GROMACS .gro file of C-alpha atoms in nm:
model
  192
    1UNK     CA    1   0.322   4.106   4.111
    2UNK     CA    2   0.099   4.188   4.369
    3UNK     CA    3  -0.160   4.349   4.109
    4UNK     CA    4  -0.393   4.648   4.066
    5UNK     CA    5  -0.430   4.829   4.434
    6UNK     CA    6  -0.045   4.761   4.524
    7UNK     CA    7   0.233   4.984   4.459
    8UNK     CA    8   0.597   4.888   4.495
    9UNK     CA    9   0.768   5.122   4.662
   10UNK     CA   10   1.080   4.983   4.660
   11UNK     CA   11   1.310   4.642   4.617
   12UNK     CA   12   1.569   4.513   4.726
   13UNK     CA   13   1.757   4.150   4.629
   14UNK     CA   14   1.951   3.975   4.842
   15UNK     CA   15   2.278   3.745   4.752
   16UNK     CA   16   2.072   3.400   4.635
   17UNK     CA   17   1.829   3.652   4.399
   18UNK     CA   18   1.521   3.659   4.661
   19UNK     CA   19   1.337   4.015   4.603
   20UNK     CA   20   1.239   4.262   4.903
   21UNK     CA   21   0.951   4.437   4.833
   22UNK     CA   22   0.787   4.721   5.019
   23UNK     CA   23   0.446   4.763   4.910
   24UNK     CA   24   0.153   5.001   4.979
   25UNK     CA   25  -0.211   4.949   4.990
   26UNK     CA   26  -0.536   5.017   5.094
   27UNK     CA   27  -0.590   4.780   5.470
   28UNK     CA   28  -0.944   4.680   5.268
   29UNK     CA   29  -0.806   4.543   4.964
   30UNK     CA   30  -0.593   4.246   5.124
   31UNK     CA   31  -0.754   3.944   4.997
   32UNK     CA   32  -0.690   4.095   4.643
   33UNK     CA   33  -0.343   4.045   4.698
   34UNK     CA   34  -0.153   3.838   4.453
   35UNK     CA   35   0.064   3.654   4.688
   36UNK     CA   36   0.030   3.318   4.778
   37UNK     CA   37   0.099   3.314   5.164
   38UNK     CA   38  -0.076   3.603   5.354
   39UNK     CA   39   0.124   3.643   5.770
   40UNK     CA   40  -0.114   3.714   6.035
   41UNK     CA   41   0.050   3.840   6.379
   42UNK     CA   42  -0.184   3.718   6.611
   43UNK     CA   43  -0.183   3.588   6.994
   44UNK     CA   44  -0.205   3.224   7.122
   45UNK     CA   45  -0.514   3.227   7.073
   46UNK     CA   46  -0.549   3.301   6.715
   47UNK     CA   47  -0.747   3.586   6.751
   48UNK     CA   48  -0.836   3.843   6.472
   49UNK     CA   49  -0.955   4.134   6.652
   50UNK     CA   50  -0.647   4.376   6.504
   51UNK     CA   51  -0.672   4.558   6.176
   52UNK     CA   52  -0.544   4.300   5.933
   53UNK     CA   53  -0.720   3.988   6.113
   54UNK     CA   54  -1.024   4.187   6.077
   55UNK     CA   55  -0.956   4.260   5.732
   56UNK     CA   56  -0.918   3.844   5.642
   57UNK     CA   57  -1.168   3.781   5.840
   58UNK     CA   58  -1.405   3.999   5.636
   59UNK     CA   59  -1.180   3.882   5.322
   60UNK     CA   60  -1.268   3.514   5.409
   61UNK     CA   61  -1.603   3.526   5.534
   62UNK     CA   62  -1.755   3.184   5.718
   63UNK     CA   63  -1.509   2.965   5.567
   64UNK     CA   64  -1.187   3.108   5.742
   65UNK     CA   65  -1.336   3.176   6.101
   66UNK     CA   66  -1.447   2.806   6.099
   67UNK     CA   67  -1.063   2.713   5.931
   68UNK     CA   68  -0.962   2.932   6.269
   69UNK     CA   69  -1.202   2.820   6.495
   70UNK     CA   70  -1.093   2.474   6.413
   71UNK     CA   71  -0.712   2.560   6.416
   72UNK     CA   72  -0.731   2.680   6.771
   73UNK     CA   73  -0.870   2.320   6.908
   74UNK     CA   74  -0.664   2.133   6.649
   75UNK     CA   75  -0.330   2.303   6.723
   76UNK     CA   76  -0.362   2.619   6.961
   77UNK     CA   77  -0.257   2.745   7.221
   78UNK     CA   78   0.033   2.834   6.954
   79UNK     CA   79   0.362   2.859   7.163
   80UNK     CA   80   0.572   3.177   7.169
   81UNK     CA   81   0.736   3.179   6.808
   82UNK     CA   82   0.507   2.923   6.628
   83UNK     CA   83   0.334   2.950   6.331
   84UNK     CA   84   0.027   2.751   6.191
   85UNK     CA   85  -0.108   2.782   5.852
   86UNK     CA   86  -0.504   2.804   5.717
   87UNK     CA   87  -0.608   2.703   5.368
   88UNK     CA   88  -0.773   3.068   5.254
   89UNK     CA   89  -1.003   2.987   4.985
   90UNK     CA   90  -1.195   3.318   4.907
   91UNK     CA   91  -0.884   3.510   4.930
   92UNK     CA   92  -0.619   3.490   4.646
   93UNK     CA   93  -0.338   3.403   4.860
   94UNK     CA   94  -0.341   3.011   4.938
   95UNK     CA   95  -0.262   3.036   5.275
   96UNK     CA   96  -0.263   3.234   5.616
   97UNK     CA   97   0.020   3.203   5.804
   98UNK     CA   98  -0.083   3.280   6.144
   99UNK     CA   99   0.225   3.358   6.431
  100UNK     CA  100   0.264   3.392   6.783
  101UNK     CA  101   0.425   3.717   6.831
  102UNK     CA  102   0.629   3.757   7.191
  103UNK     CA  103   0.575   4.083   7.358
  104UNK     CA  104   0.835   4.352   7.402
  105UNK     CA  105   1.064   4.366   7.667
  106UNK     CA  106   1.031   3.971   7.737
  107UNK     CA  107   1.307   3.785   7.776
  108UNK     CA  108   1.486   3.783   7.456
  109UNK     CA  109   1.181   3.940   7.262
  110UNK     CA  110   1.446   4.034   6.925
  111UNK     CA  111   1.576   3.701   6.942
  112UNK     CA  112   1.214   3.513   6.947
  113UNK     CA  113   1.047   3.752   6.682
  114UNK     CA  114   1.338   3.656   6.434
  115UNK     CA  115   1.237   3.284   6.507
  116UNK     CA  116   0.872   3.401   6.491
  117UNK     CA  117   0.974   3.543   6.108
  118UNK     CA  118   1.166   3.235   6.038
  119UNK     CA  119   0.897   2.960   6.164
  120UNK     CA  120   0.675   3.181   5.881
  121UNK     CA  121   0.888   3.161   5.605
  122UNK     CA  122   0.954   2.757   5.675
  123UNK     CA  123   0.576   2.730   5.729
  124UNK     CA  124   0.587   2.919   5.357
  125UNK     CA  125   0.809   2.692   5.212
  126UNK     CA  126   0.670   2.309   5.354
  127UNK     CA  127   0.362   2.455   5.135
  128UNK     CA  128   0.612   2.534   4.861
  129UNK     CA  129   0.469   2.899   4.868
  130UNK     CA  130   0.687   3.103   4.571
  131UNK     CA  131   0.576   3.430   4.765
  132UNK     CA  132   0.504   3.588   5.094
  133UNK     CA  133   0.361   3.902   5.216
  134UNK     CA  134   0.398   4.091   5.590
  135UNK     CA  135   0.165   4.274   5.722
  136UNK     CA  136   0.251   4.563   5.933
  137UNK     CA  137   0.347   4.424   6.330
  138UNK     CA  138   0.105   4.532   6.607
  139UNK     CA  139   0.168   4.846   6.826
  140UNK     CA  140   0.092   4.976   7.147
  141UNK     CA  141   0.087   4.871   7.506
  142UNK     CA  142   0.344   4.564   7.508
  143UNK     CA  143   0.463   4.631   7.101
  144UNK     CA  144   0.795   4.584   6.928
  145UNK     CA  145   0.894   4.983   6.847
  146UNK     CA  146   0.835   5.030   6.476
  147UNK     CA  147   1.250   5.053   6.435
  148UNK     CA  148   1.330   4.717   6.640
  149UNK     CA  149   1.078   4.543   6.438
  150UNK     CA  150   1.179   4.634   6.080
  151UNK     CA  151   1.513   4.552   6.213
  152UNK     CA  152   1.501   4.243   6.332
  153UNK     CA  153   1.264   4.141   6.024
  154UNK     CA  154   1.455   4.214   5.758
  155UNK     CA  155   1.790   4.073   5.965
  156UNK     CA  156   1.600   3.678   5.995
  157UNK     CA  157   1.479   3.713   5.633
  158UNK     CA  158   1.807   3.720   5.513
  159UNK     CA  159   1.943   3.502   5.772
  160UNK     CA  160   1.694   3.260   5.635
  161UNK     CA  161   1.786   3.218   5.302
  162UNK     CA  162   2.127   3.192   5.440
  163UNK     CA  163   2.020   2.851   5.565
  164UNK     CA  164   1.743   2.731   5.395
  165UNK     CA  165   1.774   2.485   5.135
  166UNK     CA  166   1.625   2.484   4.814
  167UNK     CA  167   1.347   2.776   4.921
  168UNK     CA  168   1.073   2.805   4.697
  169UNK     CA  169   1.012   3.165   4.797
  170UNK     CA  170   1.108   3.392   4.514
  171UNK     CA  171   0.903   3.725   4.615
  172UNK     CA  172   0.915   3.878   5.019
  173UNK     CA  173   0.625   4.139   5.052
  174UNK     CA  174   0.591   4.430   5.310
  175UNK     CA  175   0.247   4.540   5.334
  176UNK     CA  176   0.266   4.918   5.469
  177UNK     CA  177  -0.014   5.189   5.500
  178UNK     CA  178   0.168   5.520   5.657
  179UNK     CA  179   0.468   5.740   5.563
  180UNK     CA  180   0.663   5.691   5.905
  181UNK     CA  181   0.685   5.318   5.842
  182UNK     CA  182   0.768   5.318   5.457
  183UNK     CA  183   1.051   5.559   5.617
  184UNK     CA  184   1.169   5.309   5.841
  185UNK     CA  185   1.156   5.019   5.646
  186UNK     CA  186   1.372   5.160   5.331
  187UNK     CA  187   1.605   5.329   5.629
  188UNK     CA  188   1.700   4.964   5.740
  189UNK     CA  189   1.693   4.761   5.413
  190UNK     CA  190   1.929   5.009   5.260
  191UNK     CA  191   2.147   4.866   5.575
  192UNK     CA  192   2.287   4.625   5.302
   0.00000   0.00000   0.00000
């Protein structure tokens, strides 16, 4: 499992046997995590000024804001939907998977976020990842509403495994620090 500083809150396991996981923890204990592909939400750019790229950043030290600093020129801008992975040596977790999140109210913004989530999990799986954690998706301004998001999420997820083949992810993750979203979340996975 995730290990000491994460609790499961509760699980769910979808038709092929893939576990759904909500987890809680501490925002400074990330890159204790036991899970082997971290997502961070991020902007074209890459950038890591939001709680959780702040917390990897600090997590990975030198070595990851050069691994991002170098991502941006090799790859970046990242589209609308993409996904790009770091190597995240000094964290547990193997990876980052970094995505390009659309902003509400764009055109089609449900239908792009569930190809954001599924562009992660592939990215997950071309690294043969056996498990994946999400962090909580940004809010404010031009945000997804807390509902929509764990909606949508949990709807390409599933949708996913539906037609993947031969996934090597065994273990889904949702990272979650306050009451309303634990609420939320276990409101739409019991949708089942």
């Amino acid at each position: 499992g995730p290990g000491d500083g994460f609790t499961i809150l509760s699980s769910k396991s979808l038709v092929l046997g893939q576990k759904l996981s909500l987890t809680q923890s501490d925002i400074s204990h990330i890159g204790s995590m036991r899970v082997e592909g971290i997502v961070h939400p991020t902007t074209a750019e890459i950038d890591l000024k939001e709680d959780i790229g702040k917390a990897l950043e600090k997590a990975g030290g030198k070595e990851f804001l050069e691994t991002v600093k170098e991502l941006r020129k090799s790859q970046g801008p990242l589209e609308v939907a993409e996904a790009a992975v770091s190597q995240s040596s000094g964290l547990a977790a193997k990876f980052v998977i970094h995505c390009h999140i659309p902003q509400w109210g764009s055109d089609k913004c449900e239908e792009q976020l569930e190809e954001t989530i599924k562009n992660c999990l592939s990215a997950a799986e071309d690294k043969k990842l056996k498990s994946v954690a999400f962090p909580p998706f940004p809010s404010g301004r031009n945000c997804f509403p807390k509902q929509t998001a764990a909606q949508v999420t949990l709807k390409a997820i599933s949708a996913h495994f539906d037609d993947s083949s031969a996934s090597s992810l065994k273990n889904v993750y949702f990272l979650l620090f306050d009451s309303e979203s634990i609420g939320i979340y276990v409101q739409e996975m019991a949708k089942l």
